[PDB]
Design a protein around this motif. Structure first.
Motif, PDB file in Angstrom:
ATOM      1  N   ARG A   1       0.402 -40.163  74.734  1.00 34.28           N
ATOM      2  CA  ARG A   1      -0.629 -40.143  73.707  1.00 34.28           C
ATOM      3  C   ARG A   1      -1.391 -38.820  73.671  1.00 34.28           C
ATOM      4  NH1 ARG A   1      -4.371 -45.318  72.174  1.00 34.28           N
ATOM      5  NH2 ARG A   1      -5.329 -44.441  70.282  1.00 34.28           N
ATOM      6  N   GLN A   2      -1.721 -38.296  74.847  1.00 40.77           N
ATOM      7  CA  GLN A   2      -2.465 -37.046  74.959  1.00 40.77           C
ATOM      8  C   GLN A   2      -1.765 -35.859  74.299  1.00 40.77           C
ATOM      9  OE1 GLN A   2      -1.119 -38.346  78.467  1.00 40.77           O
ATOM     10  NE2 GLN A   2      -1.975 -40.002  77.217  1.00 40.77           N
ATOM     11  N   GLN A   3      -0.437 -35.846  74.323  1.00 40.66           N
ATOM     12  CA  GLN A   3       0.283 -34.724  73.734  1.00 40.66           C
ATOM     13  C   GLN A   3       1.055 -35.012  72.460  1.00 40.66           C
ATOM     14  OE1 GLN A   3       3.411 -33.568  76.809  1.00 40.66           O
ATOM     15  NE2 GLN A   3       1.915 -34.672  78.070  1.00 40.66           N
ATOM     16  N   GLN A   4       0.659 -36.055  71.742  1.00 42.48           N
ATOM     17  CA  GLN A   4       1.336 -36.361  70.493  1.00 42.48           C
ATOM     18  C   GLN A   4       1.064 -35.212  69.514  1.00 42.48           C
ATOM     19  OE1 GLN A   4       1.718 -40.911  69.446  1.00 42.48           O
ATOM     20  NE2 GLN A   4      -0.368 -40.581  70.212  1.00 42.48           N
ATOM     21  N   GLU A   5       0.005 -34.441  69.766  1.00 43.00           N
ATOM     22  CA  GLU A   5      -0.324 -33.314  68.892  1.00 43.00           C
ATOM     23  C   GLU A   5       0.717 -32.201  69.035  1.00 43.00           C
ATOM     24  OE1 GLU A   5      -4.090 -31.575  69.980  1.00 43.00           O
ATOM     25  OE2 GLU A   5      -3.454 -31.125  72.030  1.00 43.00           O
ATOM     26  N   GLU A   6       1.598 -32.332  70.021  1.00 42.71           N
ATOM     27  CA  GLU A   6       2.628 -31.324  70.255  1.00 42.71           C
ATOM     28  C   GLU A   6       3.971 -31.709  69.644  1.00 42.71           C
ATOM     29  OE1 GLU A   6       0.742 -30.047  74.621  1.00 42.71           O
ATOM     30  OE2 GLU A   6       2.838 -30.666  74.452  1.00 42.71           O
ATOM     31  N   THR A   7       4.023 -32.878  69.015  1.00 45.46           N
ATOM     32  CA  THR A   7       5.265 -33.366  68.411  1.00 45.46           C
ATOM     33  C   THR A   7       6.011 -32.328  67.573  1.00 45.46           C
ATOM     34  OG1 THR A   7       4.432 -35.644  68.343  1.00 45.46           O
ATOM     35  CG2 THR A   7       6.327 -35.133  66.956  1.00 45.46           C
ATOM     36  N   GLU A   8       5.366 -31.819  66.531  1.00 44.18           N
ATOM     37  CA  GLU A   8       6.001 -30.835  65.661  1.00 44.18           C
ATOM     38  C   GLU A   8       6.378 -29.542  66.378  1.00 44.18           C
ATOM     39  OE1 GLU A   8       3.232 -32.537  65.006  1.00 44.18           O
ATOM     40  OE2 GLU A   8       3.458 -33.526  63.063  1.00 44.18           O
ATOM     41  N   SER A   9       5.571 -29.142  67.354  1.00 45.85           N
ATOM     42  CA  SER A   9       5.847 -27.921  68.102  1.00 45.85           C
ATOM     43  C   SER A   9       7.101 -28.091  68.952  1.00 45.85           C
ATOM     44  CB  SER A   9       4.655 -27.568  68.990  1.00 45.85           C
ATOM     45  OG  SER A   9       3.515 -27.279  68.196  1.00 45.85           O
ATOM     46  N   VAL A  10       7.258 -29.280  69.526  1.00 41.83           N
ATOM     47  CA  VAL A  10       8.428 -29.572  70.341  1.00 41.83           C
ATOM     48  C   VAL A  10       9.657 -29.557  69.433  1.00 41.83           C
ATOM     49  CG1 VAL A  10       9.607 -31.315  71.736  1.00 41.83           C
ATOM     50  CG2 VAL A  10       7.164 -30.912  72.051  1.00 41.83           C
TER      51      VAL A  10
END
Length: 159
Positions: free
Chosen positions: A79-88
């Motif tokens: 949950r903490q890094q869902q903001e990294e989805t598109e970057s991944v």
């Protein structure tokens, strides 16, 4: 980690955190993998997937890489890094722009990326969500987009 382990870890993280995102990276259609096996041999095909695995591991060292199918890998974003989805996803697309070379032969993989946000509130961890993220990966390939998010209708009017 294999398919079962991913399902188990997703279930545990959802119960504890309430949400997470799974990313499925499909290296190539099963049919194309089979063409490679018949044309260059099964050992060659295994080495190819091992090389694909190493490239993902090198690009995303801080990520646990799961093996979903003979052509698919899975990533679990808390949950903490869902903001990294598109970057991944962008990093994976960039990583596979260059052919994967194994046994001296370059193979261009057009990776299909499926993105599936999961929620504990609807007991997503208890459901067979794998099919959904895999279908999304195929959808990304079919549409020719960078990645495809599971986006089902929310009501009858939208269905």
């Amino acid at each position: 980690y294999n398919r079962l382990r991913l399902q188990e870890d997703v279930s545990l993280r959802l119960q504890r955190d309430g949400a997470l995102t799974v990313i499925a990276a499909d290296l190539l259609p099963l049919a194309l993998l089979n063409t490679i096996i018949r044309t260059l041999g099964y050992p060659f095909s295994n080495d190819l997937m091992l090389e694909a695995r190493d490239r993902i591991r090198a690009e995303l060292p801080d990520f646990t890489l799961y093996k979903i199918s003979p052509t698919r890998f899975g990533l679990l974003l808390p949950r903490q890094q869902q903001e990294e989805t598109e970057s991944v996803c962008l990093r994976l697309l960039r990583a596979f722009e260059s052919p994967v070379v194994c046994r001296g032969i370059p193979i261009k993989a057009n990776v299909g990326l499926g993105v599936l946000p999961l929620a504990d509130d609807t007991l997503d961890g208890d459901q067979d969500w794998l099919r959904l993220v895999v279908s999304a990966a195929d959808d990304a390939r079919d549409r020719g987009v960078g990645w495809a998010r599971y986006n089902p209708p929310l009501d009858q009017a939208q269905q």
